Amino acid sequence: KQKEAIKVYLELLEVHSRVLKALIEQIKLFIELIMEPDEDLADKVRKSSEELKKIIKEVEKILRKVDDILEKVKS
Amino acid sequence: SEKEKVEELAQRIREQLPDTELAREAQELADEARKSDDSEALKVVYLALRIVQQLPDTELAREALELAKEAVKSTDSEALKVVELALKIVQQLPDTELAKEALELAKEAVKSTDSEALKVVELALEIVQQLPDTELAKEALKLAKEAVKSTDSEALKVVYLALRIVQQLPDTELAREALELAKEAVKSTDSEQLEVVRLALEIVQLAPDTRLARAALKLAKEAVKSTDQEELKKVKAILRVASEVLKLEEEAKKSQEEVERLKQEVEKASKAGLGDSRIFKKIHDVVTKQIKVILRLIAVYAELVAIIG
Amino acid sequence: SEKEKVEELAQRIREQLPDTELAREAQELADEARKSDDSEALKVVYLALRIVQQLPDTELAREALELAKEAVKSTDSEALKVVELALKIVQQLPDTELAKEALKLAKEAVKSTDSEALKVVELALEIVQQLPDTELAKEALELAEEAVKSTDSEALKVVKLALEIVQQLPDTELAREALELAKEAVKSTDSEALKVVYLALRIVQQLPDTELARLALELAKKAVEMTAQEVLEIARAALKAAQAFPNTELAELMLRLAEVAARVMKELERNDEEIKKDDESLLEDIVELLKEIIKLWKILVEVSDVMLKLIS
């Protein structure tokens, strides 16, 4: 019912806070790369991108859970 | 009681060296102070007479008397505080070049009508007082003396920010880098370099002891060294974007704290049963704020993209 | 020379309809034009009198006489050209709503002394003359009317750019979309929407016949549809990024990212509407929001990779 939407919104809030942190790191590193080109800075930017991809995977898991619940409701 | 102290020092000075120019000037200054009801001017005159009693028949005492008279003439409280700090520096560090330089800087500050030069000179004097016998004090005093001469207000703001950075983190690489950058910016006649240095110093103050701060300092140094105008505008835009990113980071941290508190409150309300519609409304408010912060971050991302191209 | 033509038309009109208000107005206009030595004022009075001779005792002739008098009062060459084009349109499409609305717009332009409004109205009249008896001419005329009525300085420039786009690519999907977008922007009271629409139209004109132009048109339409200022700020940032870096795959990805973010905000609004009131519909809207969220983050990852390739 509504508690399911509540828990989905909570999961989204936590994921989006982690997104905020990763995005701030990514923008800081991009400014640093613009001002000075380095290879290790590019490596840590790639690490940030990997973190963002893991976040995307978590969002996909949330979506598949909600989809299973919707498919059970429609039955 | 301050009037009593001033008059007692006046009588002590009159008994110390009568029939001298310093004695007559001290008597007249003590009279003009007794006429006053302002305690700050009373402290000014007290420090002046204390310096006179400290060094009788000297040039420093004459400078102190003249500066104290000109400060009593002024109605601005900031000039009063500046003269107080200058005379107090002369008292704390006698027989030092910094005392004479600070007296000259305080005279130049009182003579100026601008309100920002008073703050700048007060900051320089506080730097001298808190860090005596240090290169930072002399460099800050020289920087303030150079800032008073410049016509541009941007130079005043830049030197204010540089002295602030020095006071916040003394004996750090950031402080000496900010001092050198502010000196080289005051030397340059260009105002765009002043804007770049101001933005870099603001980046430093917003995020002290961070990688962004030192990176922006190095970029501002190499931009002051450079002579390309397009790269100068690009550096200005990059520094503005960095400052916006710092502000957005603060906002995002506040939003994350809100998210944690909302999760706690949601679990508490689910345990208690206090109903679901109000919880959904609070969740909607928090989601709105967080997603607006995310969208601002995306906009800054696209702005950076436009800058690099 | 031209005075001869004007005075002959005046005497012929006097012989055609005596003891009428139109006769007195035409004679006064002819006398005032005869006193004037300017060639353009003489040509405008000639057109007005020829219109009076073509449509005697009609409202169009009265409005043309009044417009000719007001143009004689004005010294701006652009306003004179506007009045001349309006009268030539009246002659070109007699007894049409386009001619009446064009006379009205010409009067509204003459009233204002600003040069940008005169240029916009001249552009609209050139559109009407170039495409007579077409819906695009009607839309451009109404858009210019709405622009002149608006006090915002950006609205005039936006409408001028839209009309330039229409003239450059007539009877195209891009021109129709630009007309509708400019109309919706003038309808909007927000200035951020006007700036976003100007950026979109500038992207269309600066790079026609490209996917980025269509993307910018879609993004600007969806931004004007939304009432949120944040979506407009995102659209403005994305359009500035696209304008600064054209003919690139990364700008395409950036416009796509902005569109996905606008769709995410739309799904947020839908979720709010459903909260204000079924569980199944709420779950479906949550599913759609999660889909668009995943797309947004994927596009952000792609943008990050492309920027890393550009900086390395």
Numbering used by the authors:
A (entry chain C): 1 to 75
B (entry chain B): 1 to 274, 278 to 312
C (entry chain A): 1 to 277, 282 to 316
From the study:
Over the core heterotrimer in both structures, the backbones are very similar to that of the base heterotrimer crystal structure, but the resolution is not high enough to determine the state of the designed hydrogen bond networks. The designed junctions between the repeat protein arms and the core bundle are recapitulated in the crystal structures and hold the repeat arms rigidly in close to the designed orientations. Deviations between the crystal structure and design model in the repeat protein arms increase with increasing distance from the central bundle due to lever arm effects arising from the compounding of small orientational differences in the structures of the individual repeats. These structures show that the DHTs can serve as rigid interaction hubs in asymmetric assemblies, which have been more difficult to design than symmetric ones. Subsequent two-arm fusions were made by combining the two working one-arm fusions and testing nine more new fusions to chain B while keeping chain A constant. Eight out of the ten designs tested had three equimolar bands by gel; six designs had a distinct heterotrimer SEC peak present with the ABC species detected by nMS; and four had a very good fit to the design model via SAXS (Fig. 3f (row 3), Extended Data Fig. 3 and Supplementary Fig. 1). To test this idea, equimolar amounts of individually purified A, B and C of DHT03_2arm_A21/B21/C were mixed together and annealed to allow these interfaces to reassemble in the presence of all components. A monodisperse SEC peak containing all three chains by nMS was observed at the same elution volume as the co-expressed tricistronic version, indicating successful reconstitution of the heterotrimer from independently expressed proteins.
We designed helical heterotrimers with specificity conferred by buried hydrogen bond networks and large aromatic residues to enhance shape complementary packing. Crystal structures of a helical bundle heterotrimer and extended versions, with helical repeat proteins fused to individual subunits, showed all three chains assembling in the designed orientation. We succeeded in determining three high-resolution structures for DHT03: the original base construct, a one-arm version (1arm_A21/B/C) and an elongated two-arm version (2arm_A21/B21/C long). We show that computational design can create cooperative ABC heterotrimers that can assemble as free-standing helical units or as hubs in larger designed assemblies.
